[PDB]
Amino acid sequence: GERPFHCNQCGASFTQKGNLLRHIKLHS
Amino acid sequence: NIINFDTSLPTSHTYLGADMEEFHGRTLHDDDSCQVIPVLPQVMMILIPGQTLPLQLFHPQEVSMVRNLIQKDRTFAVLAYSNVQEREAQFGTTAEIYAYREEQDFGIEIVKVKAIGRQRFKVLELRTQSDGIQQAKVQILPECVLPSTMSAVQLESLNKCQIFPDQCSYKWWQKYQKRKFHCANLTSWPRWLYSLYDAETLMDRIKKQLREWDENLKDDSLPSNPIDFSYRVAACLPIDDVLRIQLLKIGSAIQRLRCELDIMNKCTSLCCKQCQETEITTKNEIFSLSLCGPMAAYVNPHGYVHETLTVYKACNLNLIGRPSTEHSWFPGYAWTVAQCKICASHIGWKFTATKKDMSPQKFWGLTRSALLPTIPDTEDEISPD
Amino acid sequence: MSYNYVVTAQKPTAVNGCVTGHFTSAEDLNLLIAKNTRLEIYVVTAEGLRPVKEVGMYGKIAVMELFRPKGESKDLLFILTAKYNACILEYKQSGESIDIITRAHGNVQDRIGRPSETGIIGIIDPECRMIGLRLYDGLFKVIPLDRDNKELKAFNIRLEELHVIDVKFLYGCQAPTICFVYQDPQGRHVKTYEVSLREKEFNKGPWKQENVEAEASMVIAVPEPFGGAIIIGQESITYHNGDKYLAIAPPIIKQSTIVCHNRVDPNGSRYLLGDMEGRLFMLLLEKEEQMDGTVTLKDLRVELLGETSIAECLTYLDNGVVFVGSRLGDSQLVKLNVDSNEQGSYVVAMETFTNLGPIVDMCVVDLERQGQGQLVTCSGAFKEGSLRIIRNGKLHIRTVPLYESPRKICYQEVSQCFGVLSSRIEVQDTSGGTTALRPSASTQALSSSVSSSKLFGEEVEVHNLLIIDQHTFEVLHAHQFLQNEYALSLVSCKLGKDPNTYFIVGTAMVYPEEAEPKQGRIVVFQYSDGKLQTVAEKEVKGAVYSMVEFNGKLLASINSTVRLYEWTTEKELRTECNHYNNIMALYLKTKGDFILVGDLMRSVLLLAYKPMEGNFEEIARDFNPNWMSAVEILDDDNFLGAENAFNLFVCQKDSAATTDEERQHLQEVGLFHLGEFVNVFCHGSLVMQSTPTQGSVLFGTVNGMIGLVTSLSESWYNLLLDMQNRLNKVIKSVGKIEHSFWRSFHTERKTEPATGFIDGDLIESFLDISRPKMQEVVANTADDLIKVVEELTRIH
Ligand SMILES: O=C1CC[C@H](N2Cc3cc(C4(O)CCN(Cc5ccccc5)CC4)ccc3C2=O)C(=O)N1
Ligand SMILES: [Zn+2]
Ligand SMILES: [Zn+2]
């Protein structure tokens, strides 16, 4: 069980950091 | 279809932990008076009078500001940002803290707050102080109360007939219109026209649409005053910020109620805001899982506020990750982040029941900031009155 | 910034109240009649009514009651205006000089208070110890009647019953006692309270509430020796004197709601009752005479006396004569003929008094010669409906009874006739179909026709277009509209390259289930060769609220849309362009290529037709929430409107302003409390045709008052404004009411002084003042001012 990169706005859990950073930049 | 959940739980904001230090007192400033009120810096909200706003403040300057408010008037200013980037705001609403809780968890001082919208205002001036916290020179906007449309004409002999007391509801409304608007024959217009500007008739028309969303009584849940009813309905209408600001700028409850009815009838589809042409849900799937209606403001563990609209079915959504019950706004349900299938923008969360005996077993919570109300067929956008 | 002048052409004619007593002399019986801002005083002679005095007040008469306090040789008159001005007046004549002197006065408005739903109620104690007023809910204001209360100081008592329907002071009580009907969730009840002037509070009343009729609306205090009170509803007339209770549910009263009454016998044995349909009844409380108990009340009776005009107020005078005060039709003096069959009825008319109100529409027409204009109004409602032709002689008025509601009117010079939209009530048959109540203009036309379709006892409204001859005023033709079709707008004009003149009607389909109309028609008719034909018919997706001839085209408003149609060579309407608005387009007015769109909530919008683009462009707007009853274009830059609490206002455009925000904003430049409710604004004049006034807009009101608005120059306005303040120092106001206060723009939420308007009635009263008073006014030059004022009287 991985996913140690959460988006503090929606709660999206990502297994890699480059995946989270792309998701956070889509928010406002 | 059947709601085997406790509708009173989301309104309590139970996810914010232990019982907060509740306040009983209420403060209101005189109409048209000028007041200097502090603004919360990271609040990006457009608050409606009567609407509940939960917050989690982390910054020591935000925590300090609230400790001072709790001791003083408990009132802060919530700016309606026209341009959020350059912090431009011409209007806003006061918010009165009715509950609070301080926590020194791990080693960080954080304050959880529950506030409510009170009075609309016009921003006269904004200045950021040498501390970094800004104050707003504000003018309290009055609520325009108009008398009965028949008050100007009304025959004095029929004044004693203006108070009205198992049987056919249509026959009741027929008698209501004939008696309330009898003096319309002294004017250039018919009774049926005056009904379109009658608070009780407009409120009854809105109630008929609200009953389609919630299986709950007018008797208790809904307010009697047109001002409060119009603001209660405005708070749970899933519209974009440009429309909500115009709706807030309305001073007359009659115009507000008329404007809401028109939005409720025109805007039947809800699309993703970034796509604009990706339907997520329709008004026919909207339902109330909270006593305040289908949509209410909730705060996440990092202070981000989401006006979450509950719907039975949603389409064009991808689910990210696995479900979690962590900080769930609907106790007994687990959430999974939901994105738009075309633009991948966060639209909301899918809520799935933890026990087999719960109903509905699944529903969606959509964040208002990601949605766009749409009028299908061959028409673009307009909000009459 | 606007300089306007408003003057009365015809004083209000509708009667809102009438009382009898001994006001002019202790020996004379008087009839006092209130016609809004006017009070008429009559001596009730054996003959009929002898006029004595007529005064004007700087207020709308809301309460009017006579009373004789201890010692006083004759009755005094209490009056309360709609702006809460209270006063006690005395009639005093010394030789030739008649003067309504003000014995006491004061404003009784409270800084805080929700004006009651059942309006103002003003009652006087039977011993004249106090005046009770119910202006606001939850409070009962008491003005103690003392000789040393010349300022009319008052205190309030908290009233837990917030929804009081009607209240009266009872007779025979040791302490002053009020009896009232109130409503609460549980229903309607009748309660009593004693009024302590010493403690300035209420004490437990003499008797119980009980759950009285659900539609109980009227309280009548019965005088001695019976006492108690009669409570009238929709089905029942009940009596209450605590332990004594008598009830009746006469089937004769079930046809219409009883809405006014009057005591005939001073002992309270007989009462007159009037309903909303003009029926007049006699209520008799049968006094039974037992051996010991000779004062029993065995039963109540109701007798239908006959039909009168729809009564706002009744008053028994003497010798069977009754004065019927009417708001919807002509007022009457009727003789209650002593026990007479007369083929059913007992009421015989003696006199009829002209009432132009309500004026719901009107039009100006040159008619004979052309020079002097004549005004033709849509007056009355229901059986009281009529057309009135008003010309300058005093104003000479000709009446044309229609026995149904006239609604809209326009003149067609070519066919030498008028087009009148009217409506009549028909009742649904248990057998199937609908039956008319009486013969009326639309059922008694020479020729008739019905529209062709392109789609129980309940009252049904049937709409018609009447063609009325301009010379004889005979109903030449009557065209009946479709079932559930409501006729809203009417125009007479030529369109496109067509030489024919048509009558165009705009309608709406009205169904009870639908709140907002989704269907309507624009029907083009031609009245030619003594016959009416349907030339064309356009179905629209909404109600056609208004229409105007716009430069050879037809501009029509369908719901929130404003559509311009062209008349083709195939004699059909072709949509040229549309304009979708933020508001419902109720009001439509045009000057050149400019259009004024407005809604019932004072949302004003200005549009301009762009001929080189073939579309509409918004020029300016102004949205201030308030009820708006009528609108008009004064000139290219000024717009006149009628808004809530009987005011007038003027909005102005400034096409020259530096920024585009300023030039698409309309400035409120005129505000004035008219005291009347305007229904129609109409360009024209009643005078025969290098002038100090520019333009002439006539207006018709609910009370039958006719006024005139004209524009002035800055020099003329500045002079007349100073003149007003000088005239106010010398003129004597009845009730000592301030002119500035009276004319101040009024809503309950705000009161601003009048701006941009000259009260022509005050200016004209300079000619009535004495020569020493005239010289006081001109003390900065007196006969040069007389020339100025006489020139201003020539506009009406
Ligand atoms: O019903 C709802 C709808 C979702 C919404 N949430 C919850 C939420 C939580 C978070 C976190 O960073 C996620 C990570 N945990 C640490 C952790 C990791 C693994 C295991 C256990 C604990 C800290 C918090 C970020 C954003 C949101 C958000 O928007 C809400 O509050 N209620
Ligand atoms: Zn996120
Ligand atoms: Zn999308």
Summarize the structure.
With 28 residues, chain A is α+β, with helices and mostly antiparallel strands.
Secondary-structure blueprint:
The complex is a heterotrimer of chains A (28), B (385) and C (796).
Chain A: E1 5-6, E2 13-14, H1 17-24
Antiparallel strand pairs in A: 1-2
Chain B: H1 9-12, E1 21-22, E2 34-38, E3 52-57, H2 60-71, E4 75-83, E5 88-105, E6 108-128, E7 134-140, H3 169-180, H4 191-195, H5 199-210, H6 218-221, H7 226-235, H8 241-249, H9 253-266, E8 269-272, E9 279-282, E10 295-299, E11 305-311, E12 317-324, E13 333-340, E14 346-353, E15 362-367, E16 371-374
Antiparallel strand pairs in B: 1-5, 2-7, 3-6, 4-5, 5-6, 6-7, 8-9, 8-16, 10-11, 11-15, 12-13, 13-14, 14-15
Helix pairs in contact in B: 5-7, 5-9, 7-9
Chain C: E1 4-10, E2 17-21, E3 30-35, E4 38-44, E5 49-56, E6 61-67, E7 76-81, E8 85-94, E9 97-107, E10 121-124, E11 130-134, E12 139-144, E13 155-158, E14 164-169, E15 177-184, E16 187-196, E17 201-204, E18 218-221, E19 229-232, E20 237-241, E21 244-248, E22 258-263, E23 270-275, E24 279-288, E25 296-307, E26 311-318, E27 321-326, E28 331-336, E29 347-353, E30 359-365, E31 374-379, E32 386-392, E33 395-401, E34 405-412, E35 417-428, E36 434-436, E37 447-450, E38 459-469, E39 475-480, E40 485-493, E41 502-509, E42 520-528, E43 531-540, E44 544-550, E45 553-558, E46 561-567, E47 573-580, E48 587-591, E49 594-598, E50 603-610, E51 615-623, E52 628-633, E53 638-643, E54 647-652, E55 667-673, E56 678-683, E57 694-701, E58 706-711, H1 714-730, H2 739-743, E59 745-746, E60 751-752, E61 757-759, H3 760-764, H4 771-777, H5 783-793
Parallel strand pairs in C: 1-61, 37-39
Antiparallel strand pairs in C: 1-58, 2-3, 3-4, 4-5, 6-7, 7-8, 8-9, 10-11, 11-12, 12-13, 14-15, 15-16, 16-17, 18-19, 19-20, 20-21, 22-23, 23-24, 24-25, 26-27, 27-28, 28-29, 30-31, 31-32, 32-33, 34-35, 35-36, 35-38, 38-39, 40-41, 41-42, 42-43, 44-45, 45-46, 46-47, 48-49, 49-50, 50-51, 52-53, 53-54, ...
The complex binds ligand A1CNP and zinc ion (ZN) (2 copies).
One zinc ion is lined by residues 272, 274-275, 278, 340, 342-343, 345 of chain B.
What does this entry look like structurally?
Chain A: This is Zinc finger protein Helios. Chain A: Belongs to the Ikaros C2H2-type zinc-finger protein family. Chain A: A zinc finger (C2H2-type) spans 5-27. The complex is a heterotrimer of chains A (28), B (385) and C (796). Helix content of chain A is 29%, strand content 14%. With 28 residues, chain A is of the alpha+beta class. Chain A has one domain: Double Stranded RNA Binding Domain (2-Layer Sandwich). Chain A has a two-stranded antiparallel sheet. The longest helix of chain A has 8 residues, at 17-24. The relative contact order of chain A is 0.28. Chain B folds into 3 domains: 3-16 and 268-385, Beta Complex (Metal Binding Protein, Guanine Nucleotide Exchange Factor, Chain A), CATH 2.170.150.20; 17-141, LON domain-like (Archaeosine Trna-guanine Transglycosylase, Chain: A, domain 4); 198-267, Methane Monooxygenase Hydroxylase, Chain G, domain 1. In chain B, the strands form 3 sheets. In chain B, strands 1, 2, 3, 4, 5, 6 and 7 form a 7-stranded antiparallel sheet that branches. Chain B has a 6-stranded antiparallel sheet with strand order 10-11-15-14-13-12, with no helix packed on it. Chain B has a 3-stranded antiparallel sheet with strand order 9-8-16, with no helix packed on it. Chain C is mainly beta and 796 residues long. Chain C has 3 domains: 1-14 and 356-711, Methylamine Dehydrogenase, Chain H (7 Propeller); 15-355, Methylamine Dehydrogenase, Chain H; 712-796, DNA polymerase, domain 1, CATH 1.10.150. In chain C, 6% of the residues lie in helices and 51% in strands. In chain C, the strands form 15 sheets. In chain C, strands 34, 35, 36, 37, 38 and 39 form a 6-stranded mixed sheet that branches. A 5-stranded mixed sheet of chain C has the order 56-57-58-1-61. The radius of gyration of chain C is 28 Å and the shape is globular. Classes of the chains: A alpha+beta (28), B alpha+beta (385), C mainly beta (796). Chains in contact: A-B, B-C. Chains B and C meet through helix 3 and helix 4 of B and strand 26 of C. The complex binds ligand A1CNP and zinc ion (2 copies). Residues 272, 274-275, 278, 340, 342-343, 345 of chain B line the site of one zinc ion.
